[PDB]
Amino acid sequence: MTLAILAVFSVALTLLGFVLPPQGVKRATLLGLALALASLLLTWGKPFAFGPYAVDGVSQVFTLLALLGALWTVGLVRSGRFEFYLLVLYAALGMHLLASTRHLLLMLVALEALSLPLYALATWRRGQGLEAALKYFLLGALAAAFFLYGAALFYGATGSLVLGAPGEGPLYALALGLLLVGLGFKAALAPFHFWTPDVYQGSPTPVVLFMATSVKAAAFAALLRVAAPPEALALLVALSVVVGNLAALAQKEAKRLLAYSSIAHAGYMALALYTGNAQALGFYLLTYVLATGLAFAVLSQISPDRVPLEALRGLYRKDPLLGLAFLVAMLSLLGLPPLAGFWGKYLAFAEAARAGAWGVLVLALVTSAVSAYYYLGLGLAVFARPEETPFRPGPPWARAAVVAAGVLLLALGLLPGLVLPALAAGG
Amino acid sequence: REGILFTTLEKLVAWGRSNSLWPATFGLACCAIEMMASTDARNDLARFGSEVFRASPRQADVMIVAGRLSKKMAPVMRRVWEQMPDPKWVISMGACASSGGMFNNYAIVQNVDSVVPVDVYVPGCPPRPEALIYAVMQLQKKVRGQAYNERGERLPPVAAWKRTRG
Amino acid sequence: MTLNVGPQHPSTHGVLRLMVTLSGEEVLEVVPHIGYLHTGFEKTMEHRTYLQNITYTPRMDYLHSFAHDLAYALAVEKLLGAVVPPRAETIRVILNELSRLASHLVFLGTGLLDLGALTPFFYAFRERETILDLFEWVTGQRFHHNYIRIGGVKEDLPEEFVPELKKLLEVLPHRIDEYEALFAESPIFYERARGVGVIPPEVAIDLGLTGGSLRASGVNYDVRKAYPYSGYETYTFDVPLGERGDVFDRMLVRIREMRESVKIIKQA
Amino acid sequence: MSYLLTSALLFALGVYGVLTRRTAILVFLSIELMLNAANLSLVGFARAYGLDGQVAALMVIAVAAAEVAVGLGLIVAIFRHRESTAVDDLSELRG
Amino acid sequence: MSLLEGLALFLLLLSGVLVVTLRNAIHAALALILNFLVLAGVYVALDARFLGFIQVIVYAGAIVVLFLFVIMLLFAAQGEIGFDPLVRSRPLAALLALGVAGILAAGLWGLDLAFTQDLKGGLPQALGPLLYGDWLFVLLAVGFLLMAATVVAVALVEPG
Amino acid sequence: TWSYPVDPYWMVALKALLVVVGLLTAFAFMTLIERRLLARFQVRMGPNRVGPFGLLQPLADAIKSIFKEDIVVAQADRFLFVLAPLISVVFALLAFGLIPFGPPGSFFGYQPWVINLDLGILYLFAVSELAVYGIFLSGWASGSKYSLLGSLRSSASLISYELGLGLALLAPVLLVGSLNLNDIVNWQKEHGWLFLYAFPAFLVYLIASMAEAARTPFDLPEAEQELVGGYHTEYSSIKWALFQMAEYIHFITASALIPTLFLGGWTMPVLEVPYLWMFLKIAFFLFFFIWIRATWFRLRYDQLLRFGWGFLFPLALLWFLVTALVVALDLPRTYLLYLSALSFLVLLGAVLY
Amino acid sequence: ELGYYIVSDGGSMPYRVKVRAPSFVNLQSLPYACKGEQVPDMVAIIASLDPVMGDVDR
Amino acid sequence: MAPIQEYVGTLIYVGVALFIGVAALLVGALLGPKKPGRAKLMPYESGNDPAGEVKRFPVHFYVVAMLFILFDVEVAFLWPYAVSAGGLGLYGFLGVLAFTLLLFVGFLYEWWKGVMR
């Protein structure tokens, strides 16, 4: 019904865009997304299924996030190839579609649907991003097959093709794994994440924005609907979080660092699943998204192409406001209070503690200190060094946006008791 | 291994071969224009096993060397000849080819038979189409072995063992 | 790539070796490579008599044989200042125009054959035979002729020549039309021909094109009008013309020519 | 039952396939086989559970096809300015 | 049954072996079609007849040709050095192959079921209405997926 | 079949065997008629010697084909060379036993087909992919990129048209509610011959089957007197004959299907004469194509690609959709009748100016 | 355009026979004529101009 | 269900054809004399047909190929629908129409864009 809008706009634009000038298409596309986004908000607390399409609060929330991220990315585009809008739209719908289901076959299709156009967006013909593309594609296609066999084994273990199935011993135990890998890769859980660093290094900032938001969201969305072994879960997480931060020491490449971080973050999100508290998981992802979204915008404003550490420094000179924003971000990303990141962590942990999982949590905590290295490594770098190299100033659109974002960050830090109320299932 | 060496086979196969003649014309002269004439429009050739009238040796083994030629054409023709299958016949059509009519010159090649062996000459430039018919009737009964020379002397049923075949 | 289309193919039968620089789906340029036949007639004929040279003249034009012959004849005739009887001159035009028709028959015959539908060739050929039969009559030769002789042709016309000549002039108009009938409609004919064969009139002269290429681009340039030679001065007939260099145009010109030629016969 | 064992083998073989293949395109081929391995399994189970695994299959096929096409499209776009012939002939993202 | 049945599955597997052996592209590709013949046959044999045909039509009929056309487009291959001919990795790959089946095998020595939901076997007849309703979503999704795919593909190739 | 005969493994075999060689002899004498009918058509005498009527000339021809070198040339691989014609002929042969020849249980009381299935349309459609496989393969096999490129054109184009044939076959399945031939035939047995019902689908089908390999778009590059098909001219003897053979077998196969479809093959309420009525329909379309084939031109595939793709296929499915509307609400089939007839009438009226 | 440029020295044979061969000159205009054309079209474009090879070859 | 008889029959048919096929080739093969390819470097067109300065080919052809697959899938779905067509009512009809309409959109994009030259 919001979905209704999406499909329509997408399809309509498809042909329409041929006649329209690309600028008119940027205008159009912006409107559509926003319109869908609005209606979503405005339909909060209306629980409506049609079939496998089955809207709840969770669905609503996670697709909220997805559209948000995409709105941001769409902002930035200043190259005349109309396709880099067109495809994004599509993809967004695909993830909407992904979220509101529990019927496996649609879910499968849906995973593929969002990933395909993503590949294309991986190319503005930057040579690295094609190398990247290829690897990624092939790896994706592998994960597909797993995910497909898993589904087949779900039909195997029970005639069900929809979750909320009755479950069994061994085979189902297998089966859940064969899905979890697929989902894992898309959420870039270790050791299925690897490509994401390489690809990010190769890929342009904006692209990454969308990916780093939406895909993770989406993956988790579906993951929640699945019910998983806590020991398995624990393994994955550990490795993810460990390897991530350790490798993040190695860096020179901001983006690639951030990839590693969001694997740690992915692990952290994955805690929630013992309970399956989607208030918590909702909360988390919102927070994560914001910071990361913010970060890449700025990074783009530097250059849309490979960035060294040095490029970051002296940012307060370049613009103060942005420097502060970005700082706040890093701290939130540290999870530091009195930013929302603290709550996100806390919440996850609380559900973890309900599960009583100790070791896991301990490990988690260790590495959560680790992360601060590079966060200050950037966030503070802003304030030091009188040098800087050419950068650009951007539109007021994005600038303002960013500053809004940073205020919203620390705002929810201070007022978490706002969202929690309507993260029950929204409201 | 070609359909011979029992009474039956050789007559059989030879009838087959003889009656299926597929002409590949090697125009480069006036001959061609008379050759299209020679095809249709008064007389036929389809009643002599010919729908093949066109440029593939991949369709034919009856070589009609039709027209006056130059130095530049000799290796070409040679090679074209080579890119035919193993049994193959050489008609030397018309005077222009056969011994070089009224030209004695460096440019030209006289006595086309130089370039490739021949089994049939058919003089006249122009000849009549019909002469060519008479010629292939010859060539028919020639490969049938029911022929001689003007001295009563027998000869092989092919053009292709007068110089090397391939 | 540079594609090498060799001699004698497929049924186009130029000695043609053609270096087609392609885009792998287009032609860019052709460097034609030719000259794989040659004799050096021009040489040889200095080693034969003038009479003898008349042997050589139709032996380099499969088509209108008699024109070469005539042109050579004229040159000689001029040189020593010899004149030609009026009747002779009558005959000469008749053969010439008959030979033009022949040429056209062969042109279009091949045109069809070359590509497009194959068949109508055979009909055009039927007519060609008729023409040939006429030649056979008078010169005893299917083609190649020596009937034309210095001072005028070497003997009188057959009486038999008169019936048959009328006869074929009767049939032909209708026939001509029916060949034409195949072309102008057939919207596929359009789609194969119209766009292609381009070249400016200006460049036609610069690179040298001659009538029915030049006049195929509708540029009036009959050498029979411009440098009018025998009899044609006193014969009416007009120039058939196109108005652009394309295949499409060429083809229609020729048909019109034939009709003009026929009226000239009629006049004759 | 046999067939369903067979299906798992065919998948396994396919994995070995994917891993051996040096050139990329053949990888992609190996994958396709795996996809059908699944679907075979699925068919067996459809006899059990009543042919929803048919409808499933149909869908699977279509997606697979889709995913083929576009990937090959990508392969094209990679090597219409390259003479390379395997995935790891592009390597610079590695650190 | 198990003689011929056995064979057919053997053959199927056999086809698999070939495609993972060969480094003669055509032969490879072609084998995979022969695969799909068997596989289809077995579908039909297992009363999935409609499915039998669709396998034939699409998966075999369409796809591999498309594959070949690319390998033609860009020329075949045969050259066995990566930068790393990873020859050491051949047995290690084969190890993983054993495991991944092995684990499934364990699960299935204890698996038990019948196959007895029999109605009319794979025939689009009874499947249509269901498809048109329950799977309808899926259908529409599909239709969109493909269309998007088209757009993608186009955009990938040409400048523009 | 759920109401239809069965016959022994042996009887099945016999019928098959017969039908194969029957189609050999078919092809032979078909050539004869084609040659002679061509001659006559272009006012000419033809094969008449070695006959009478050139009867034995095909024998000669065949014999010619054999007793020859038949070799693979360097820069090709042996296996591929051998396979590449083979494939095409098998799959050309295959698909004809599906189609009947008369009323049920009436081939001397035995069934008038060799296979009959239950899934008519599918089988046909399926076989349609496999010939083109043979084609392009040959191209590649040959190892001239010249041959290859032709084959790519060919196949591409063919395959384009192949799809339109798909969009055609849905339409009658609507009407009968089934896809097996017999029933389809029988549908016409009550109501009447199917082109009445759907003239533009008859039409569009017709012209799509043209687009089959048949020497009748009559450029492809085809082989015989143009730039050549790459499935030839890199071939020799018998193998070459096979290709040529195949093209013709297609031609007739298509010529058979069109009767199958739009008429009954032997339905004719006026009289039942099984075999006769089959041939008569065959004959009609056969000549019909050949008349086109003669009097119409070689068509640049450039043009063709533009032509089919953009105009022809979209209009075909469009017609289907309309019919589907009607059929979905299950309305008077009269309601199509008027329209079908009219569209033809329109598009017929469109010819003259 | 046809014509013969004939130098005679007054012998019994000419001292020069030049032949003006039109078609030959017309062929010069072929790379031009066939600029940027389409590949199946190129065959016809040759044919349409009428080659008699005698002009060319001489 | 369906009778197993004709499917069986399919296998039979295939067995016949293939045999006769194989028979023909061995006749052809075994007959005729054999000589070396001593004077074989090319087989069509003296002056040497071009290859090996080609290795690229228009993607045009790719486009077509890719297209075709997508549409073959289209058809696939419309078969169940065709069969059961009546009785699925308007609700049927609307679903299908939509689906179709999507693929008609496909065509229109690549056509108006026309990068298949």
Ligand code: SF4
């Ligand atoms: S013999 Fe006469 S007709 Fe033949 S090529 Fe020579 S000149 Fe021409």
